[PDB]
Amino acid sequence: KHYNVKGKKKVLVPVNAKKTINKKYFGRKVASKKKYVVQRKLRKSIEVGKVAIILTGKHMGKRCIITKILNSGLLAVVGPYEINGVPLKRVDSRYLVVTSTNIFNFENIAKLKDDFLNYAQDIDDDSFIKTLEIKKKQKKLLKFMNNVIDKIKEIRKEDPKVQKLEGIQKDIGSLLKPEILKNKVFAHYLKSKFTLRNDMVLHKMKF
Amino acid sequence: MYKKEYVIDCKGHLLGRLASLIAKELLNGQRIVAVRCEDINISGSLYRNKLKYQEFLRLRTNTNPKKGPLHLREPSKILWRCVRGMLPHKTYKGQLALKKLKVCVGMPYPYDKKKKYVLPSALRAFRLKKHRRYCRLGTLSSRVGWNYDTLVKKNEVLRKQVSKAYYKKKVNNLNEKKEIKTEALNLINPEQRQVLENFGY
Amino acid sequence: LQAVRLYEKGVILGYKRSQRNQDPNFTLISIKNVNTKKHAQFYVGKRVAYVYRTTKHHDGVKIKCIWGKVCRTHGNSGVIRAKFKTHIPPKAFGDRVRILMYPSN
Amino acid sequence: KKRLQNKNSLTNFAVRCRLNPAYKLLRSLAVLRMRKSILEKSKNKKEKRVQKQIQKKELQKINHDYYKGVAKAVKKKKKREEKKAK
Amino acid sequence: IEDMVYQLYTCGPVFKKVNNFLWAFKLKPPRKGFKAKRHAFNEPRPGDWGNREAHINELINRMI
Amino acid sequence: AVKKVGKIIKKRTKKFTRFQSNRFMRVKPAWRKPRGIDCRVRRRYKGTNLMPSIGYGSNKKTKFLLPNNKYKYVVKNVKEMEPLIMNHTKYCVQIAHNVSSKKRKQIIERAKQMNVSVINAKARL
RNA sequence: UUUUUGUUACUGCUAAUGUAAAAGAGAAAUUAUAUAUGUACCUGGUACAUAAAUAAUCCUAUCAC
RNA sequence: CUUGGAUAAGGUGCCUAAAUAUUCGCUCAUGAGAUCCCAUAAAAGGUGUUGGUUCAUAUGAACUAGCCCUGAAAAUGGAUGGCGCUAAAGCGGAUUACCGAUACCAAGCCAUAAAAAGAAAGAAAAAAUUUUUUUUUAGAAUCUUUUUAUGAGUAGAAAAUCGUGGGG
RNA sequence: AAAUAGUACCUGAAAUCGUUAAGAUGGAACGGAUUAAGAGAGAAAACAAGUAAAGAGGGGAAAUUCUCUUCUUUAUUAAAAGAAACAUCAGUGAUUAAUUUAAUUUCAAUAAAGCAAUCCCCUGAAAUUGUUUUCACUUUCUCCCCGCACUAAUGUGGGGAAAACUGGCUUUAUUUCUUCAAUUAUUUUUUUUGCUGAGGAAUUUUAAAAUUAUUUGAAUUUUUCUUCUUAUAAUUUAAGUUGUUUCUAUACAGUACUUUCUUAACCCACUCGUCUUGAAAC
Ligand SMILES: [Mg+2]
Ligand SMILES: [Mg+2]
Ligand SMILES: [Mg+2]
Ligand SMILES: [Mg+2]
Ligand SMILES: [Mg+2]
Ligand SMILES: [Mg+2]
Ligand SMILES: [Mg+2]
Ligand SMILES: [Mg+2]
Ligand SMILES: [Mg+2]
Ligand SMILES: [Mg+2]
Ligand SMILES: [Mg+2]
Ligand SMILES: [Mg+2]
Ligand SMILES: [Mg+2]
Ligand SMILES: [Mg+2]
Ligand SMILES: [Mg+2]
Ligand SMILES: [Mg+2]
Ligand SMILES: [Mg+2]
Ligand SMILES: [Mg+2]
Ligand SMILES: [Mg+2]
Ligand SMILES: [Mg+2]
Ligand SMILES: [Mg+2]
Ligand SMILES: [Mg+2]
C-alpha cells in the first residue's frame, strides 16, 4: 500500500494498536484508531556491500560489512568473524558511520555477490530476540562469581536460534575469507579500528 | 585553550591588549606563564607615561598609608596588577582565575627549555603606526626605582649563547635524519612510495 | 594505544545570561576546533555527555553522567547552546564534556 | 464543540482543498506547465533568442530616444545656469 | 475564504462587513528587528514611522 | 520548580514563609500578608520573599489525590467504613489518632476483607 | 628504605580517600617590521646562500598470541 | 503559574551575554576624548593640521569652518563606573551579523467575566478457553459538560473561606 | 503501679546555659532563584492476579453435606506500570539548495566579412524643445631628433610620425569554449535539526474533503499528481500521538528510586512600623 499527496508516494505498512484508556462515562476502549503507518526510508548511502564503523557497543571502533536491510528499519552486519572477531549482529543504522568503499567493487571479489545474496536471505529479524524461557534459565543462576559467568555463556550456546545464526555466519566466512586475504592492505584495514587524532576536525573530514 | 599550559614571552606586546587576552583565557580555565615581562611596550611617550605613574604614586590612605594602594614597581608585578583589574577578583571563582597566572622577569630555568608562543592580535608591529611614540616598560620602571635592569640583560646574553649552541646541534641532527630518509625511500614497495608521493609526504 | 576516542572535546562555560540575570535552563559550550558560526551548525543534533567523579560508591561505581543535546548556535564565533535533562551545577564551569557522534548522518 | 488542533491551512493538502474547492485544478495546471518547460531544455530556449531579435529591436529605439532626451534636457539646464552665473 | 480575499484586495461592494467580521490581527515581532521606531521612514536616518508605500509587504512577511 | 510524577503536576513544593521570621523569634513562620508602607515584599522587589497567589492552583482533575492516586477518608469505628464497599478503587482509608489498639485490629481486618488499602496500618503494634 | 589484599562486644575513636579539571592534554634559535638569518674572509664591512598566507606545519600511534 | 520562539530601549576589548566585524574621512594633547535628563565653561587668540570661497604673473594675499591648542586657581587620596585604549577600544557617516525584558507570538494549567446547552438512561474494552476473570456502566440547578476574552494597586468598599470559649 | 511523683513534690513550653557528635570560618550574619555533594528516614502507585500440595483459623447455607474467605511454606505461571533509544504523524521554529511564467534601455563569448583614424558606442568644449555644423576625446611591448643613461621603473624627460594588434560600430548563426546578471510580480520544491502531544465523542472524530483500485459519462491543459464525488469498496493527508525493542527486574528496601534537613557554588537581595510631595536615612 501507499498514498500519494503532492507527489510524494509515502509507503504504508500495517501496525497494531495495544494501549487502552478510560472512557468518559462508561467502560474503557483502545486508544489508537490507525491501521497503517509510514515506513522509514533509510539514507542514500546504505548499500549491501559497504564497510562501516560501530560507534557504541562492545565493538566500538571496529569495522564491518553490511549484509541485509531487515524489514524493521535496522540492519545486520558481519565483519567476517574469521577475519575480524565480529559475528552476525544487528545494529541501528543511526549508530554507524558508512564509508565510500564497497567490497563488490574489487574485481577479485565482485564475482561472488550472488552466493553472498543467497546466504543472506535466511537472515531473519525474529531470530535475534531471545525467548522467555532462556531469560528465565539465565536469571535463575543468581540464587562464586566465576562459575556463573560461564554457566550463562553455556545457556546461550544451546538456543536453536543462536545455532541457526551461527551456521550462516560460518558459511559467509568460509565463502568470503580466502579472497579478502589476497589484498594485504585491505585485510589489514579491516583488522584495525578507527580513532580520532588531533589535527583532524570532523567537519572537514570525509569517510 | 585545550592544553595543560601555555608559555608566552611578552617582548614586543602592548600592555592592555595582552592583558585583555590573558584574562579571558584565565576565566575560561587555562594556566598561563608569562616571561620577559621587562620588554613589554606602551603606546605613549616615555615622559607622558612617567607622569601617569607619578599621579598613581600620590594617592594613599591619609590616616595610615600602610593600608591603601600599594605601589608595586617590578615590570612583571605591573602586568599582574593590570590583569587583576580585568577580572572579578572579589568572588571565589574570579579569585581562582587570578591564581592561575605566573609572571617572570627574564627567563628562569623551567621555561628556558619550553616552547614560547606569541599573540599577533597584540603585537606592536601590527597595531601602532610608525610615526607614533611609545616606551619600554623596563626603562619606565627603572625611572621609578626598580634597580635590576642591567642584571637581567647580562643574564639574557648567556641564555642566548647557550640557545645558539643548542640550535646548531639540532640543525645538524635534522640534516643527518633527512639523508637517511631520502635513502630509505628506495627500499619500499612501489605502492607505498606512490601513495606517499601522491599526498606529498 | 588503547581506548579509542570517537568524540570531540569541549569546555562548559556558564549559563545563558545577560548582565545581572541568569536563566539556567540553557548552557554554553565551546568546541575545540570550531570558531565560526557556520562551522558550529555542523554539530546541531549530537548528544552531549558530562562525566565526573564522586568519593562514595553509588551503584558499585564512582562515575556518573548527565545527558544533554546540542540545540543551536550562539553567534559569530562557534559557541553553542545546550540543554540537559537536569541543570548543570555551577561548580563545573571549566570542566570537560564529550560532544559525541552517535546520531550519525 | 470541543476544540481540537488548528491545522495549517496552507501546507496541509486535505484542509487546503477543503477551504478552496479550486486549488487542486490550479496546482495541477501549474505542475503540468512546469514539467513541460523543464523538459524543453536544449530543444526550446533556442528560439527565445529569436523573439529577443523580434521585439527588443522594436522597443530599443523608443527607449533609447526617451533616455537621450532626458539627458539632453538636464545638460541644457546646466549650460543655461552657467551662462547666467557670469 | 476566497470571496473575502477578493472583497478585501479590491474595495468590493462588501468591504465594511467583511473587514468588520475579522478579529484584529495579532502579529509576531519582525525576524531581523526594526531600525528605530523613534524616527520616520522618510527621514535621512534609520527610522520607521512614516507611510512606506509598497515596502510594507516585505516587513509584514517578516512578522507573519 | 515544577514536579511531575505521572499525570499529576505540582507547580511548587517549597512553602511560603513569613517575612522577617528568620531574624526575629517572636515572629512565627506561618504566612501573613504584609501591610504597611515601605515593605519591599508588598511592593514586589526582586530578591526577597514571594507572595502566594491563585495562579499556583492545581488541576481540577487531580486536586486531592495522594501519590496512591486515590482520595483519603478517615474512619473512627468499624461501622463508619460501610460506604466504601461501592467505590473501593477511588478511596483509601486512614485510621483516626485516638482509637485504641483493639479497635484498630478490627478495622484493619475488615478493610482487608473489603479490598481497600490502609495508609497507616502499622501504628500501636 | 620492593610486592599482595583493600579504603563498596561497645568509651568520641582506635583499619584506611582525595581532585577548579587525562583520553596523543606531543613540539626549547635569534632578530627586523620601508626587511631578516647562516656560512666564508677582512677589521662593523664584502661575497654567496636560505625563509617570506612561514602551526594553512612537522612528529607520534593499531602489525595480537 | 510555566515551556519554546523572536524582539524593544540599548549594546558587542575585559569586567559582562554578543564584532579586537566590514567600509570611508578626521585627530597627537609635558593636565586628549568618550552621546537625552546629567552632573559647568566664555570673550579673545594660534605661521598646528584639513577642506572651501574671492582677489592679484606661481608666488603674494584676504576671508570661511571641522578636530587640536592657549585662555583654565582650593582645600582627606580618586575617578569617561574600573582597567585601559592612539593600524582606537576616540569624533562624523555607511553596510551586515549578533546579544538582550514580567512587553509580543504558539501550546498547557488556575481564577474572574460572559456564552452554547442540559429536568425521559443505554454496554465498552482487555486477559484466559466458545465459558471464566478485571475496570467502568454518570444525572447533586449557587449543579454538570464544553467555548472565548481577561488578570498592576495606597486610602477605601464587598464576597467566599479558616480557627477560639460556651448553647440546642 | 509509678520516685525523671521526694514535700520548692500534677503536667512541665519559650527566652537563657551545659555535654557529646557532625560541619563552616581573609573587616557582620541570616535570605530569594537553581542545582550538586553528604547524612537521616521511607513502600500507601513506585512488578506478578491466578493455579497446585499442605498446615492453622473464621463464617454462610441445605449434627452431615456443600460452599466462601484470612494467614504460613513449598513450586509454577502470566499481566500491568515508569524511564531511555529509535521511528511515524500533527502543531510551532531554526538552517541550505533550488525553481515556472512575466515585467523592467542589462550583458558576455566562438566562427567569417567589413567601416571610420583624434576616429568610434559614449563624454566634453564652442556656434523652450527638435535639427545642423566646427574642435577635442586611444595608447602600442613600433620609428625619428634633442638630453646621451639623463628614470622610482627589466628604462626615462621634451618634440614629432605611423598602426588599427588593442578599443568601438555594422552584416550572420551561432550559445556545454564561455555568458544568460539584478530587482520586483506571480508559482513549485529540497538538506540537516530544537520544543510540544490538551482530549477520549451512548450516536456530528458525523457529513464533507483527500487518497488508492475498479467504473457511468464530458471536456481540455493532450497528460504514470489533467480536470469535473455525474457509481460501489477501502484508507488518512480528514476527525489535537501512535508503535517496536531494552531497562527498573525474575525486586520486597541495598550505595538504586521518593522525601526532609545540612553545607557549597553562579546571579540577585539597605531596617521594620509611622507621619510625609519625598525614608535605608545624620
Ligand atoms: Mg539573526
Ligand atoms: Mg536596532
Ligand atoms: Mg517620546
Ligand atoms: Mg505544597
Ligand atoms: Mg510610599
Ligand atoms: Mg522565555
Ligand atoms: Mg563574552
Ligand atoms: Mg604683506
Ligand atoms: Mg560607561
Ligand atoms: Mg565598550
Ligand atoms: Mg488585582
Ligand atoms: Mg467567655
Ligand atoms: Mg496500672
Ligand atoms: Mg492528678
Ligand atoms: Mg583581624
Ligand atoms: Mg577587413
Ligand atoms: Mg555575584
Ligand atoms: Mg548587590
Ligand atoms: Mg499621602
Ligand atoms: Mg518634611
Ligand atoms: Mg520606612
Ligand atoms: Mg543623611
Q: Cα–Cα distance between A74 and A71 in angstroms, integer?
A: 8
Q: Which three cell numbers stand for residue D84?
A: 547666467
Q: Does E2 touch chain D (CB under 8 A)?
A: yes
Residue numbers in C near B29 (CB within 8 A): 11, 93-94
Torsion of CA A29, A31, A34, A36, to 10 degrees: -110
Number of CB atoms found within 10 A of residue A42's CB: 13
Whether C17 contacts C23, CB under 8 Å: yes
Q: Cα–Cα distance between A61 and C6 in angstroms, integer?
A: 8
Nearest nucleotide over every DNA/RNA strand to the B5 CA, judged by C1'? G25
Residue numbers in B near C77 (CB within 8 A): none
Longest dimension (CA), chain F: 62
Query: In terms of Cα–Cα distance, which of B3, B1, B67, B78 is closest to B38?
Result: B78
Kindly list the distances between the CA atom of residue F85 and the CA atoms of F91, F93, F104, F113, F115, in Å, as whole numbers in the listed order.
Answer: 10, 12, 19, 10, 9
DSSP β-bridge partners for residue B101:
B32
CA angle B100, B102, B105 (to 5 degrees): 170
Query: In terms of Cα–Cα distance, which of F84, F65, F85 is closest to F74?
Result: F84
Q: Cα–Cα distance between A13 and D53 in angstroms, integer?
A: 57
Q: Cα–Cα distance between C35 and C78 in angstroms, integer?
A: 4
B29 vs C9, C11, C32: nearest CB: C11
- Experimental approach was cryo-EM
Indicate if CB(C58) is under 7 A from strand G. Answer: no
Residue numbers in B near C11 (CB within 8 A): 1-2, 28-29
- In total, chain D counts a number of residues equal to 86
Whether F51 contacts F73, CB under 8 Å: no
Query: In terms of Cα–Cα distance, which of C33, C52, C44, C54 is closest to C93?
Result: C52
- 3-class SS of residue A97: strand
> How much is the CA Rg of chain F, to the nearest whole Å?
21
Q: How far is the CA of B155 from the centre of ligand 19 (A)?
A: 78
Whether B29 contacts C91, CB under 8 Å: no
DSSP β-bridge partners for residue A89:
A77
Q: Cα–Cα distance between B105 and B109 in angstroms, integer?
A: 12
DSSP β-bridge partners for residue B41:
B14, B136
Residue numbers in A near D13 (CB within 8 A): 5-6
Whether A82 contacts A177, CB under 8 Å: yes
Whose CA is nearest the C1' atom of nucleotide H117?
A: D1
Resolution value in angstroms:
2.5
Whether C14 contacts C28, CB under 8 Å: yes
- Could you say which residues from 35 to 54 on chain C have a Cβ atom under 8 Å away from some Cβ of chain A? 39, 42-43
Q: How far is the CA of F38 from the centre of ligand 19 (A)?
A: 13
Indicate if CB(C95) is under 7 A from strand G. Answer: yes
**Burial degree of A180 (CB within 10 A; 0-12, 13-18, 19+):** buried
How far apart are the CA of D45 and the nearest CA of chain A, in angstroms? 27
**B15 φ/ψ angles, rounded to the nearest 5 degrees:** -65, -50
How are beta strands C47-53 and C96-99 bridged, if at all? antiparallel
The answer for B87, left when phi > 0, alpha when psi is -120 to 50, beta otherwise, is: beta
**D60 φ/ψ angles, rounded to the nearest 5 degrees:** -65, -45
Determine which of A54, A92, A198, A203 to mutate to test the interface with C (most C C-beta atoms within 10 Å): A203
Give the CA-to-C1' distance from E24 to I210 in angstroms: 32
Whether A31 contacts A18, CB under 8 Å: no
Q: Which three cell numbers stand for residue E24?
A: 484584529
Q: Which three cell numbers stand for residue E45?
A: 536616518
Give the CA-to-C1' distance from D55 to I168 in angstroms: 25
Residue numbers in C near B99 (CB within 8 A): none
**A15 φ/ψ angles, rounded to the nearest 5 degrees:** -145, 145
Task: State whether C32 and B2 contact (CB < 8 Å).
Answer: yes
Chain I: nucleotides below 7 Å from protein CB are 14-15, 27, 29-39, 43-45, 69-71, 77-78, 80-82, 84-96, 99-101, 104-106, 122-126, 128-131, 174-176, 184-185, 187-190, 192-195, 198-202, 205, 208-212, 221-223, 225-229, 235-246, 249-251, 254-256, 258-260, 264-270, 272-276, 279-280
Q: Cα–Cα distance between A173 and D6 in angstroms, integer?
A: 57
Dihedral sign computed on CA atoms, order B18, B24, B27, B33 = negative
Residue numbers in D near E2 (CB within 8 A): 20, 22
Query: In terms of Cα–Cα distance, which of C77, C100, C101 is closest to C28?
Result: C77
The number of the ligand nearest the C-alpha atom of F37 reads 5
Query: In terms of Cα–Cα distance, which of F76, F98, F73, F99 is closest to F88?
Result: F73
Whether B25 contacts B96, CB under 8 Å: no
Q: Which three cell numbers stand for residue E60?
A: 509584514
Q: Cα–Cα distance between C12 and C26 in angstroms, integer?
A: 11
How far apart are the CA of A5 and the nearest CA of chain D, in angstroms? 7
Q: Cα–Cα distance between B76 and B148 in angstroms, integer?
A: 12
Count CA within 13 A, CB hemisphere, residue E49: 5
E63 Cβ contact list (under 8 Å, min separation 6): E27, E28, E29, E30, E31
Q: Which three cell numbers stand for residue B159?
A: 641564555
Q: Cα–Cα distance between C80 and C13 in angstroms, integer?
A: 10
DSSP-derived letter for residue F85 is G
Q: Cα–Cα distance between E53 and E40 in angstroms, integer?
A: 13
Dihedral sign computed on CA atoms, order B178, B180, B185, B189 = negative
Q: Cα–Cα distance between A14 and A31 in angstroms, integer?
A: 17
B120 Cβ contact list (under 8 Å, min separation 6): B126
DSSP-derived letter for residue D55 is I
Give the CA-to-C1' distance from D70 to I163 in angstroms: 39
DSSP-derived letter for residue C67 is E
Query: Nearest residue on chain A to C40, judged by CA atoms?
Result: A203
* Distance from the Cα of residue B168 to its chain's centroid: 25
Task: State whether C30 and B28 contact (CB < 8 Å).
Answer: yes
Q: Which three cell numbers stand for residue F93?
A: 482509608
- 3-class SS of residue B167: helix
- 3-class SS of residue D79: helix
Q: Cα–Cα distance between C71 and C75 in angstroms, integer?
A: 13
Residue holding cell 539632453? D72
Q: Cα–Cα distance between F62 and F60 in angstroms, integer?
A: 6
Number of CB atoms found within 10 A of residue A123's CB: 21
How far apart are the CA of D8 and the nearest CA of chain A, in angstroms? 15
